[PDB]
């Protein structure tokens, strides 16, 4: 049901990870269009489908995917800034919508991709229920810039559960948002404390990538990382699979066993997004470890306030009641030039809790989702700064 669409490619092809692209052709609606083979292939592809293959535009075109009305929807557009004959790539400046929901705008692949020490990138969206049958995604090329063209290399459409329902506000008072019909952007999504997980690996069908977490660490110390054996079990009782695989809750980032030292310090993650949005934090957590309630007991702050401590610290055991049993939480924080970082940073830290007297002084995290919920109808940010 998943539809894989390499853009301007000729034939249908498989990928590095048994993922099987087909040619855009028969869902774009806009004639005429111009393919381009990229004239250099980087080391750093970990395929040449569907990145080898783009389709070029120098004036609005529309592509229209069949979906269901009622299901949510993961949207994938890749890019692969490259160089295609004849053209600048440094020249494309444009917009993407999907539907009414402005993507993309004034987006420079090259330049993001520059920042971020990137060949290639993938940005990802998960789309409410839309109640129509018809995805049409829409790229308009900058009309700011002369010679600005748009490039596409490939989009995928795939069908997705409702996996967001509601988030903690962070900084309130039991104060909950409804997430449900959120439109997102998926900023990151780490497996914390493991190893990379291809989308062939996935669970749901959904080949979401997760990486490792460390490139993200900012305290000076990383903890230390736990893993499960190969055949221990995740019990997910009624949790939909779907959420995220076993080895995201098989594997996480503690601060290790020594308390007294583990009181004396956070684990610390910080993330550059985008300002004047909301962004969810979903925090994946399974005790494979400890046995009991009140062993491993730690506070969780947010931009550098309270996502769950005083009185109420985090507990997985007391959260799922046993070893092996994953959950998860969603927290939600606006970003603003309030925040950062200039706005521009989420910082996540763990410490542990005395509150309640454990038996250790630890903490744990085993997974890390980020998304942008959207607000105006729009998710774009401005292009990153290169230095
Ligand atoms: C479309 O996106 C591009 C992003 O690449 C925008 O151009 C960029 O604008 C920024 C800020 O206006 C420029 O950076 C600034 O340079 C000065 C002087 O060094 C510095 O003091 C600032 O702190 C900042 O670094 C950046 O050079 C420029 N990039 C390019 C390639 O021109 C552009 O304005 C956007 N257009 C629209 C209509 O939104
Ligand atoms: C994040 O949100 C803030 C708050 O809305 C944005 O700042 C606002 O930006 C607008 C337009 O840039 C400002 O209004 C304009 O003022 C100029 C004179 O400076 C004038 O030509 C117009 O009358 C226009 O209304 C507005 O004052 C300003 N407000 C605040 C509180 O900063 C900000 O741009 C947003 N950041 C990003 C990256 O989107
Ligand atoms: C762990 O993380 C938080 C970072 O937000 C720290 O708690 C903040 O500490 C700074 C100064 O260290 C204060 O200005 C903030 O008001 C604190 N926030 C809250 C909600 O209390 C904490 O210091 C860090 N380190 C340790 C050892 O806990
Ligand atoms: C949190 O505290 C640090 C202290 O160095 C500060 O730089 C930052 O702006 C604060 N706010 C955040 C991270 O949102």
């Not at 800034?81 to 600048?88: A, D």
């Not at 993507?103 to 109640?131: D, H, K, M, W």
Request: proline share 7%; with cysteine.
């Amino acid at each position: 049901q998943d539809i894989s669409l390499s853009c301007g490619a000729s034939e249908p092809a498989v990928d590095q990870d048994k993922k099987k692209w087909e040619p855009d052709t028969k869902f774009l609606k806009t004639p005429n269009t111009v393919h381009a083979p990229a004239t250099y292939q980087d080391p750093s592809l970990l395929s040449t489908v569907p990145y080898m293959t783009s389709r070029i535009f120098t004036a609005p075109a529309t592509y229209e995917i069949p979906v269901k009305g009622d299901k949510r929807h993961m949207l994938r557009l890749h890019f692969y800034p490259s160089t295609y004959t004849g053209l600048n790539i440094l020249d494309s400046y444009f917009s993407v919508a999907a539907n009414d929901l402005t993507l993309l705008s004034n987006f420079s692949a090259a330049i993001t991709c520059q920042a971020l020490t990137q060949a290639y990138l993938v940005r990802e969206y998960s789309l409410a229920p839309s109640e129509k049958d018809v995805l049409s995604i829409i790229f308009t090329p900058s009309d700011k810039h002369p010679k600005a063209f748009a490039f596409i290399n490939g989009i995928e459409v795939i069908p997705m559960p409702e996996l967001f329902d509601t988030a903690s506000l962070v900084g309130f008072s039991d104060q909950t948002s409804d997430t449900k019909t959120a439109n997102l952007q998926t900023m990151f999504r780490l497996n914390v404390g493991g190893q990379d997980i291809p989308g062939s690996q996935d669970s749901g069908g959904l080949t979401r990538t997760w990486y490792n977490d460390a490139p993200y660490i900012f305290s000076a110390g990383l903890g230390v990382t736990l893993q499960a054996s190969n055949n221990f079990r995740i019990d997910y009782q009624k949790m939909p699979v779907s959420t995220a695989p076993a080895d995201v809750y098989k594997t996480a980032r503690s601060q290790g066993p020594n308390g007294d030292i583990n009181m004396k310090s956070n684990l610390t993650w910080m993330f550059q997004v985008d300002t004047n949005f909301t962004y969810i934090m979903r925090l994946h957590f399974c005790e494979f470890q400890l046995a009991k309630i009140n062993q491993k007991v730690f506070n969780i702050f947010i931009n550098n306030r309270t996502a769950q401590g005083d009185t109420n610290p985090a507990d997985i055991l007391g959260w799922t009641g046993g070893k092996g049993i994953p959950t998860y939480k969603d927290y939600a924080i606006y970003v603003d030039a309030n925040t950062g970082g200039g706005g521009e940073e989420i910082s996540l830290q763990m410490t542990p809790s005395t509150f309640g007297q454990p038996e250790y002084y630890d903490s744990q995290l085993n997974g890390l989702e980020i998304f942008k919920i959207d607000t105006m109808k729009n998710l774009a940010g401005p292009n990153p700064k290169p230095s």
